[PDB]
Amino acid sequence: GTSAEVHAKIKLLINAMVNIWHDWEWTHGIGLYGIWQYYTLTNDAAHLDVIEAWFRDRFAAGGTTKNINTMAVFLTLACVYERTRNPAYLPWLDAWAEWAYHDLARTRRGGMQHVTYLEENAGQLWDDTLMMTVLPLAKIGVVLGRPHYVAEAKRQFLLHVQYLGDVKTGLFFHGWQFAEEGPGGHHFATARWARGNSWVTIAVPEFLELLREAGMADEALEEFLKSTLQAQCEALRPLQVASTGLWRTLLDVPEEEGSYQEASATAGFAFGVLKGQRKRYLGPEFEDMAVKAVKGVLANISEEGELLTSMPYGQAMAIMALVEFARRFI
Amino acid sequence: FQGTSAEVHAKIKLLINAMVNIGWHDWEWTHGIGLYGIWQYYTLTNDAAHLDVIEAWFRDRFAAGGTTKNINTMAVFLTLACVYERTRNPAYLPWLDAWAEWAYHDLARTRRGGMQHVTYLEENAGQLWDDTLMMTVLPLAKIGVVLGRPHYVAEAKRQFLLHVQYLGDVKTGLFFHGWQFAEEGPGGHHFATARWARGNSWVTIAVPEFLELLREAGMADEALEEFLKSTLQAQCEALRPLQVASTGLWRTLLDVPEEEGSYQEASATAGFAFGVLKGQRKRYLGPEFEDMAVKAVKGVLANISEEGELLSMPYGQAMAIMALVEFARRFI
Numbered sequence: 001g002t003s004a005e006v007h008a009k010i011k012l013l014i015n016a017m018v019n020i021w022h023d024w025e026w027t028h029g030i031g032l033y034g035i036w037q038y039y040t041l042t043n044d045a046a047h048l049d050v051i052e053a054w055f056r057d058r059f060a061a062g063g064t065t066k067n068i069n070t071m072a073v074f075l076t077l078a079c080v081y082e083r084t085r086n087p088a089y090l091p092w093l094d095a096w097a098e099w100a101y102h103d104l105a106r107t108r109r110g111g112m113q114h115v116t117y118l119e120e121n122a123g124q125l126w127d128d129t130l131m132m133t134v135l136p137l138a139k140i141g142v143v144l145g146r147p148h149y150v151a152e153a154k155r156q157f158l159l160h161v162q163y164l165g166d167v168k169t170g171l172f173f174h175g176w177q178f179a180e181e182g183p184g185g186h187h188f189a190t191a192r193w194a195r196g197n198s199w200v201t202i203a204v205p206e207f208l209e210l211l212r213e214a215g216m217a218d219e220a221l222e223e224f225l226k227s228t229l230q231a232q233c234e235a236l237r238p239l240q241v242a243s244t245g246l247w248r249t250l251l252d253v254p255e256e257e258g259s260y261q262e263a264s265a266t267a268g269f270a271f272g273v274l275k276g277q278r279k280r281y282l283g284p285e286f287e288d289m290a291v292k293a294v295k296g297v298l299a300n301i302s303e304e305g306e307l308l309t310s311m312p313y314g315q316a317m318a319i320m321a322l323v324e325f326a327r328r329f330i
Numbered sequence: 331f332q333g334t335s336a337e338v339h340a341k342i343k344l345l346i347n348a349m350v351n352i353g354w355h356d357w358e359w360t361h362g363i364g365l366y367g368i369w370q371y372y373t374l375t376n377d378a379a380h381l382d383v384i385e386a387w388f389r390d391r392f393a394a395g396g397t398t399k400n401i402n403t404m405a406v407f408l409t410l411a412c413v414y415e416r417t418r419n420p421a422y423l424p425w426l427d428a429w430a431e432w433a434y435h436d437l438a439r440t441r442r443g444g445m446q447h448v449t450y451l452e453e454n455a456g457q458l459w460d461d462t463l464m465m466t467v468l469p470l471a472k473i474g475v476v477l478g479r480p481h482y483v484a485e486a487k488r489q490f491l492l493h494v495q496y497l498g499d500v501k502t503g504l505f506f507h508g509w510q511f512a513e514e515g516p517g518g519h520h521f522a523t524a525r526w527a528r529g530n531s532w533v534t535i536a537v538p539e540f541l542e543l544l545r546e547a548g549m550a551d552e553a554l555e556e557f558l559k560s561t562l563q564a565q566c567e568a569l570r571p572l573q574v575a576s577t578g579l580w581r582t583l584l585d586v587p588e589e590e591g592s593y594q595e596a597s598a599t600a601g602f603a604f605g606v607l608k609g610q611r612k613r614y615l616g617p618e619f620e621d622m623a624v625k626a627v628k629g630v631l632a633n634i635s636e637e638g639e640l641l642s643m644p645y646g647q648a649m650a651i652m653a654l655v656e657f658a659r660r661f662i
Binding site for chain 1: 495496515554556568
């Protein structure tokens with residue numbers, strides 16, 4: 001595999017994903033972000049146009065209701081605003097960040113409750129929150145010059161590591177449920193999902209970079225989150241399927257119990273591990289693991305530009321992985 | 331309160347004189363909180379005699395050549411840094427420098443960069459204990475403040491995050507005593523459960539002291555403070571139903587009945603009492619734990635003999651001193 005081939009796969013994925021896409025869910029958050037990351041790499045105006053056209057059309061349709069998932073797209077919007085300074089985005093950045101900071105339901109200990117469209121999910125913390133709401137909030141705090149947003153995001157990272165982290169394995173539980181009354185609580189099913197864990201593998205390097213670039217980095221926090229990411233990668237290493245480079249949907253569950261290989265979540269891991277190494281949050285010891293994962297993703301991408309349950313999720317993760325992989329050829 | 335400020339002060343002085351006139355002329359894992367308890371009383375009442383005891387202790391040990399550096403002997407330098415901050419005694423500078431440099435650079439590190447609980451007799455490879463926060467982390471942090479070495483403080487913040495991560499038990503809100511990193515591969519295991527009163531009280535003491543240390547030094551972090559506050563809050567909520575309502579004491583194994591050999595322990599109760607009282611006073615906690623904390627103090631008072639002993643003995647006296655001194659803060 002060469003540079004030209006990788007880029008061709010990226011464009012195949014992007015074209016297939018956007019010419020599929022005309023809704024607003026959490027998949028659009030990572031979908032737009034993958035396209036944005038490719039734009040920061042190659043500076044192709046067509047990719048920026050795709051992003052700007054998406055927001056232009058949704059905003060014209062009155063936008064959407066606010067929850068943990070719909071918040072995801074505003075990580076990209078904040079990134080775009082940082083470059084274009086488009087004043088049209090300002091009331092959107094302001095309104096949704098103010099909601100996430102002030103109005104979004106809080107669990108015990110001040111954790112961001114995983115409120116969805118259908119479900120209130122009282123007292124629940126999920127893994128994807130870090131990617132879906134916390135990082136959008138942090139980035140808006142940077143671009144609008146509102147440091148308290150960023151402080152709150154740091155807090156949420158500490159809270160989610162605390163209440164989802166599993167130091168015995170180095171992996172993460174999917175969800176935490178605070179007790180209705182009294183102290184403590186319980187994790188949902190004490191399950192270590194590939195997709196859920198991948199959100200941490202993605203969010204941590206993205207968050208560490210965001211802070212450093214904004215001049216808002218804290219050394220203790222960076223060292224802590226670095227060791228946390230390191231611990232997860234060490235756990236991922238023997239769990240990877242050596243023959244394919246993919247991980248199983250239930251990471252620590254063997255295939256004889258029904259835990260099938262999952263290319264989409266593998267792509268998510270691939271991005272985080274590659275980026276973690278590039279930004280030097282990790283050493284080079286996971287490079288072979290990450291390259292194997294990339295090869296596994298490439299082998300599971302169809303000629304239609306599809307993986308495989310969520311198809312735009314798979315395409316989004318594959319885009320993020322291959323774009324970050326393409327960064328190695330500069 | 332069916333008692334007086336004056337009686338509490340009398341009990342404090344009873345404990346101090348009992349602990350000091352005792353041994354006291356050794357250098358062990360108890361002298362850290364022993365000296366600190368005396369220091370905290372000095373900051374309250376400004377009696378030169380109490381500062382005299384502290385400075386005499388350091389003077390005699392330093393003249394005797396000090397001791398070897400481990401996670402426990404480091405404890406006394408929390409007080410030394412606190413004393414230096416006020417008196418600016420240059421005689422303390424090489425000691426503060428040498429021991430902080432050891433803690434920062436030389437002290438053995440576990441995986442994830444955690445401070446290994448190295449003691450006088452054992453290396454304890456790959457082990458993190460609860461008391462490390464008070465024994466070494468707080469000394470390092472305070473020296474970083476008084477010497478103007480911010481990287482010490484950053485490391486201290488890092489250690490607090492690591493120990494909450496690897497000793498915290500979110501299911502109960504309590505803390506495990508110890509953690510073992512696997513020799514090879516990811517993960518590991520906790521040892522001596524998350525039910526020890528003494529062990530948990532070390533965390534209840536360390537968190538308010540650390541938060542206050544940072545704020546007074548102008549090195550406080552909002553996210554960190556909110557995080558450690560909620561963590562302390564979570565532990566206090568766990569302790570509330572576990573307290574013996576009639577005596578105000580906690581059992582040595584917090585969730586284990588006396589019927590099964592878990593007796594009430596005044597020493598650890600004194601530890602909890604200090605942390606909860608100071609947590610409220612500094613507003614890290616709300617007033618909701620006031621009844622719990624006051625009943626704990628009354629339990630400690632009721633278990634102080636006329637010879638100023640509880641029922642380690644100096645450990646008990648040291649904890650009781652810290653508890654009653656902080657309780658005395660409420661009367662001014």
